[PDB]
């Protein structure tokens, strides 16, 4: 038939057991048997909402079995091409009709349990059938690209519409099936423009589909090794503009970026240069998401030495930007930056040089007006003090007098081939240790002055930090304990 005529007709629209049995009998010999039987199938599909659940179940099973048999035949064998095309078009329109009708009555429910389970089973069967259908390649069948694009949209659009309702997303099986079918659509059949636009529409209009988008992108990156779609999506996010009234859009974008950074740092890191340009926006949630994504990317990429070595310049630029972001109008962006720095410093194997910078920024931020920023800075200092690289010699002991005496001894030893630079490295290490100890002492004094705060969480974190600093022998720790003693 005609694509446009049937599409327009369906876009504007408001004893069956005997015919179903006749259709089953005719299609049992071969699915290709589909004169007047086509009208009977169309009428039966149009009567789907008014049929009984059992008759619907047999109809769906017959349709899925016939379609799977046709797909298996197309796998097996690969003037006869056009009738293959006609059969494929008829089955595609029939699948559109049945799946659009099944999408109805699902928004009404949970706006029961047995109906939901039956609908989920029918969805699983239809997803298996459509996966078998798309397993073949449609390139040779449709010589021209607009017809192929329309045929693929014929199948992709109904599932995109059915993904609107939340309960379908919660089940793992249907979500996984939709993810793999979208991945095969993007990779095996190209059309990286319609799918990305549909995902952007869903992410702008809905909040619960951000994790779905991130998981689909991760699945494409891992097995289908097609990072171009993620690059284009990130570019569109960077160039996207939001109105001053809506806030669900930026929140969904932020959630999608956070989940993507949690999932695949490496693929999304490539376009981070253009993503940084989005940080200038006045939106709060997007800035927080960018900071959180940067922190997670640099933390998870730390495990692979090759990733750090190959991407030194941009990771260094990102870390410098994160350090500079310690001051902002929004306290929440500063809190996100401190949390990202804590995630970076959770490991002490590498980036020892940046530890001093993080300590200096945390000590400076200790005087911030916001209470949450102060608590996060206290947490960062506690994490830094719990594990530090300064443990190879005389570990777990930070005494200013002893370290100063050791530095003086090293200076005297140098004053009195490998010796020269060996003593130079020892002296610079001891100077770094002295600077770190002085910074910790100043932070301890500031937190001791800060103990008297209205918020209880700040007081608790200050007490925890002071106890941790007392665990290591510190000359000024007793002053902190004395100040804490007045908390009664």
């Amino acid at each position: 038939f005609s694509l446009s005529e049937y599409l327009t007709k369906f876009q504007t629209t408001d004893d069956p057991s005997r015919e179903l049995n006749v259709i089953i009998d005719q299609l049992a010999v071969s699915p290709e048997q589909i004169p007047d039987s086509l009208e009977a199938l169309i009428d039966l599909c149009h009567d789907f909402p008014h049929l009984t659940p059992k008759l619907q179940t047999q109809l769906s099973y017959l349709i899925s079995s016939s379609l799977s048999n046709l797909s298996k035949d197309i796998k097996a064998n690969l003037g006869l091409i056009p009738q293959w095309k006609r059969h494929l078009e008829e089955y595609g329109y029939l699948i559109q009709v049945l799946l659009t009708f099944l999408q109805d009555e699902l928004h009404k429910v949970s706006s029961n349990v047995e109906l939901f389970k039956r609908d989920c089973n029918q969805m699983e069967n239809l997803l298996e059938s459509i996966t078998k259908l798309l397993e073949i390649n449609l390139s040779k069948i449709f010589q021209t690209t607009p017809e192929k694009d329309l045929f693929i949209g014929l199948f992709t659009r109904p599932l995109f519409v059915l993904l609107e309702i939340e309960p379908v997303t919660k089940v793992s099986s249907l979500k996984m099936f939709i993810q793999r079918i979208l991945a095969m659509c993007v990779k095996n059949h190209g059309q990286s423009s319609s799918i990305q636009s549909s995902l952007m529409t869903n992410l702008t209009y809905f909040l619960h589909l951000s994790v779905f988008n991130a998981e689909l992108l991760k699945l494409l990156n891992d097995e289908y090794n097609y990072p171009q779609l993620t690059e284009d999506i990130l570019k569109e996010i960077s160039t996207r503009v939001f109105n001053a009234k809506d806030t669900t859009g930026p929140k969904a974008i932020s959630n999608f970026l956070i989940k993507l950074s949690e999932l695949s740092p490496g693929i999304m890191l490539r376009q981070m240069n253009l993503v940084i340009t989005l940080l200038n926006n006045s939106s709060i949630t997007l800035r927080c998401s960018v900071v959180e994504a940067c922190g997670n990317i640099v933390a998870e990429l730390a495990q692979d030495p090759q990733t750090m070595e190959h991407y030194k310049q941009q990771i260094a630029v990102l870390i410098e930007l994160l350090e500079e972001r310690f001051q902002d109008s929004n306290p929440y962006v500063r809190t996100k930056a401190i949390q990202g720095c804590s995630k970076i410093c959770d490991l002490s194997s590498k980036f020892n040089k940046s530890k001093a910078k993080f300590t200096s920024l945390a000590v400076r931020s200790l005087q911030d007006r916001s209470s949450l920023v102060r608590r996060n800075s206290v947490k960062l200092l506690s994490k830094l003090l719990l594990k530090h690289p300064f443990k190879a010699i005389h570990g777990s002991q930070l005494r200013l007098s002893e370290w100063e005496e050791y530095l003086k001894g090293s200076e005297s030893q140098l004053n009195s081939t490998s010796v020269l630079m060996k003593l130079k490295l020892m002296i610079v290490y001891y100077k770094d240790a002295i600077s770190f100890i002085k910074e910790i002492h100043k932070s301890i004094e500031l937190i001791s002055n800060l103990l008297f705060s209205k918020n209880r969480n700040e007081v608790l974190e200050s007490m925890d930090f002071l106890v941790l600093a007392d665990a290591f022998d510190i000359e000024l720790s007793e002053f902190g304990i004395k100040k804490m003693l007045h908390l009664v």
């Binding site: 010589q143 021209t144 690209t145 607009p146 017809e147 694009d149 423009s193 319609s194 529409t201 209009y205």
Partner: protein, 431 residues
């Protein structure tokens, strides 16, 4: 619902945490020396019910409500009142199942009026409607008369008299609610009109631009189909810059969203008109409800005033010649002649008239608690004793708490509390 216990901490004279329990539901009285703190209990009761007029508690602000304005080691001022909901008739609309409802209000040096219901934080609106549902509307009172205001009851405007009459039958809680609803609908209608105007002025040019570009997209698709030689290629490549090959999906989504918005706006408008007729019909019913309430109040108030004073009568009239719902006045006759001016009446006579009116509203529909603050100041010993005896024996029913300095009132009181000033604090003791 009746008060069981009252907890006062750091409020005015009660610097420490004091608890008053064993509250007799029959009749309670409070006595003591001047300045002991008898009126401070009533001030605490007013505060825990959400007082709005701060000058009623003789304070310029919440800061004055602290023991010493937060300057003598007292920062948190908390008042806690516990109720009993044994009787389902007096139960609130939303707290029938939950027994022993307790309300706490805490004001600190920096914070202002934190409310707790049964240990759970609640907004001021929750307690406000909760107390209004049981006639305990402190903003428009019907159950308490403050100290020195017994003689000023007759001096309020006819609108205040109408409000007091509406209090008795539950007619109020609806007028102020009607005003709030009308303001909310005005604001929402303004917002909706702005939204409709912006939606039109934005989408309609964009919608017509997309419709115009639809034919160009169709032509591009036709040329692309016909391509599968260069002469078509120049036009195909020049029209490919801005063609949006996947425009159909976004167009369909935009159309669906526009249809949904139109349906939403139509439903909102229909609901608006429907609420209009519902409010109109509710007002129509309220007219006759208030008429019946006024008739009953006039009848029983006249009967009560005749009972207390043998040679006097009083009855209610509409304000001048307009309708009843536009104000009310009281007319009193002594003997066989009516008095033109209410001011010439004796202070004790005005106190008796006010007490008779309060008892009339009690008889029509009693409040759970009735507070009196030295209502016998202008009354002699005989009238005070008669009022006390009538409250104890004849009426019964609702719970009474009265602060009096005359032996004739609390001599027969079932429950007697005594307030003393020991060391910078007020203490309440039994008997």
């Amino acid at each position: 619902m009746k008060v069981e216990e009252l907890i006062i901490d750091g409020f005015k004279s009660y610097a420490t945490r004091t608890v008053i329990t064993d509250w007799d539901p029959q009749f309670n009285a409070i006595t003591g020396l001047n300045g002991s703190g008898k009126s401070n209990i009533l001030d605490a009761i007013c505060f825990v019910l959400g007082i709005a007029s701060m000058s009623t508690v003789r304070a310029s602000s919440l800061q004055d409500l602290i023991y010493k304005r937060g300057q003598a080691g007292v920062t948190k001022a908390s008042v806690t009142i516990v109720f009993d909901n044994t009787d389902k008739s007096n139960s609130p609309i939303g707290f029938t199942n939950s027994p022993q409802i307790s309300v706490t209000r805490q004001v600190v040096l920096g914070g202002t009026s934190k409310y707790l219901i049964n240990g759970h934080r609640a907004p001021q609106q929750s307690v406000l409607q909760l107390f209004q549902s049981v006639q305990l509307n402190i903003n428009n009172p019907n159950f308490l008369i403050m100290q020195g205001k017994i003689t000023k009851v007759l001096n309020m405007k006819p609108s205040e008299i109408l409000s007091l009459i509406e209090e008795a039958a539950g007619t109020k809680m609806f007028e102020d609610r009607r005003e709030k609803a009308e303001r909310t609908m005005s604001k929402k209608e303004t917002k909706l009109q702005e939204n409709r105007t912006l939606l039109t002025e934005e989408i309609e040019p964009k919608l017509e631009k997309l419709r115009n570009e639809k034919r160009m997209f169709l032509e591009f698709q036709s040329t692309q189909t016909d391509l599968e030689s260069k002469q078509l290629n120049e036009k195909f490549q020049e029209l490919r810059k801005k063609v949006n090959p996947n425009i159909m999906n976004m167009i369909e989504n935009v159309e669906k969203k526009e249809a949904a918005l139109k349906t939403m706006i139509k439903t909102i408008e229909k609901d608006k008109m429907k609420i209009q007729e519902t409010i109109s019909k509710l007002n129509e019913y309220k007219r006759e409800t208030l008429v019946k309430t006024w008739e009953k109040v006039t009848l029983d108030f006249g009967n009560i005033f005749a009972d207390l004073l043998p040679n006097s009568f009083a009855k209610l009239v509409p304000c001048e010649g307009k309708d009843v719902t536009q104000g009310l006045e009281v007319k009193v006759k002594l003997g066989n002649i009516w008095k033109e001016s209410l001011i010439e009446l004796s202070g004790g006579q005005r106190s008796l008239i006010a007490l008779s009116l309060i008892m009339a509203l009690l008889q029509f529909r009693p409040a759970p608690m009735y507070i009196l603050d030295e209502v016998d100041a202008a009354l002699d010993l005989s009238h005070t004793q008669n009022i006390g005896h009538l409250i104890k024996t004849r009426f019964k029913g609702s719970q009474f708490i009265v602060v009096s300095l005359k032996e004739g009132m609390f001599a027969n009181a079932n429950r007697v509390f005594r307030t003393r000033f020991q060391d910078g604090t007020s203490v309440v003791s039994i008997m």
